[PDB]
Amino acid sequence: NLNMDLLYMAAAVMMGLAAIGAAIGIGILGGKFLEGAARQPDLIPLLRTQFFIVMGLVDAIPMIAVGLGLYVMFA
Amino acid sequence: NLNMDLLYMAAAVMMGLAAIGAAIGIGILGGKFLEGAARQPDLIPLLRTQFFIVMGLVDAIPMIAVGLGLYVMFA
């Protein structure tokens, strides 16, 4: 009984914490980009492509927390 | 039995944290958007375009946790 009920508690709380990280983080990094674009709009293409590189690393750790969150939801 | 409420509350925690990640991530992204506008209003019609792309990613993870919170309510 309790093993399957608590399986619900774990995967949900892990994704809730990962949804904080993966949205606070690129919001902060979003504000500095949108400022840098307002600083130097000849470099919005260059900043946007530079900003994508930085964002991919931010997401990497939180994506695995959703990955485990679905794997506990499936199994 | 009680296990039916604890699987519901599992949706409640998934929703709760994911809502803070998305709200503040968008708010910090939005706050620096207003600093760009505060200097230079002619930029703001450009800046709305790049803001909406960057805001799109800030949702991408929390929206997964939103939907799973809706499903775990029904299931």
Place this chain on the structure above:
Amino acid sequence: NLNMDLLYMAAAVMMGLAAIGAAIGIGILGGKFLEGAARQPDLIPLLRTQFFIVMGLVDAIPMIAVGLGLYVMFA
């Protein structure tokens, strides 16, 4: 029977997280709006229409969590 009370509790935590998420998010966003107005008081009607493009998105995810908070109150 504990089934009833812990459903009451699960709404109350989920509600408090949504209340904090919204109140802080638009407080931050509104602070940069008031900096823009004090810096640049000619533009404040223009900035007002920008601030409300952004404000609705900050509210959107916390309001979903309020919707589930009120359903778990109601049911």
Place this chain on the structure above:
Amino acid sequence: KFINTMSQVPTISQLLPLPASDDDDLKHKSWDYLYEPDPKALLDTLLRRYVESQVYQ
């Protein structure tokens, strides 16, 4: 004052306090400066350099 090659005139003109030269614009909204370190120190250096510039002229 060197008004002309053929003619010049003695003058007395006030350099401080700053004359209210009209210099009226609205294009400041469209490019507004980042004050580093701070606005007031920059403005003092501008006023001091400006006075030196008028005296040399």
Place this chain on the structure above:
Amino acid sequence: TYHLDVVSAEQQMFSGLVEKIQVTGSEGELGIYPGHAPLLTAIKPGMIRIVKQHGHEEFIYLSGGILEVQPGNVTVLADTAIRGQDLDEARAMEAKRKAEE
């Protein structure tokens, strides 16, 4: 590319259209790419690096002054000699000494 003028009160040091520059501001280094943000700051004594349009990189020494920027037009208001409140106060005393004589 942008129109840059480097000027002083006595003479105009340099001008023309430019691809970018690197400058020692009061707070730190700054690079002016095409169409950079509006800016005002004091600049420190030293070499500044010019790259004129078509890539002709160059060094200009400046004894200091003010930098301003806006996207289409940029200028530097360079001083001729090292400026210091203490040094200028010393010149002010020197000036009084002559008055006595």
